């Protein structure tokens, strides 16, 4: 509560984004989020390793 009142949410380090294109599925593009530390609503969020996420491909016409 005190941290969010004083400074709000902010990032400390890490959480860079990198596109890999891993072929897990032909309709999704894989993206890697690097390990980092952050404070969201004053709660620390410390992650030791990267996380893989995937975005659906755009087909709207």
């Amino acid at each position: 509560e005190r941290t969010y009142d004083e400074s709000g949410s902010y990032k400390v380090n890490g959480f860079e984004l990198f596109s890999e294109g891993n072929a897990e599925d032909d309709d999704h593009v894989s993206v890697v989020v690097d390990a980092g530390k952050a404070y969201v609503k004053g709660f620390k969020v410390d992650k030791p390793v990267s996380t893989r996420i995937s975005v659906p491909k755009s087909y709207d016409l």
Partner: protein, 61 residues
């Protein structure tokens, strides 16, 4: 939307920290990743900012 007019979604939820944005080209495996994470400014960074304000208003004079 077309690549010239595509923009990210607009959000104002205080509970989430935006790490960046991922743009996917129309019907293609390629994707552009950029990081717009809000990041802290230590007191050393803020002293450096204050020093640059000094230098600007010296150059002004």
């Amino acid at each position: 939307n077309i690549m010239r007019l595509v923009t990210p979604p607009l959000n104002t939820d205080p509970e989430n920290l935006q790490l960046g944005t991922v743009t996917v080209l129309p019907d293609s495996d390629e994707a552009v990743c950029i990081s717009f994470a809000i990041t802290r400014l230590s007191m050393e960074d803020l002293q450096k900012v204050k020093t640059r304000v000094d230098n600007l208003e010296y150059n002004q004079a």
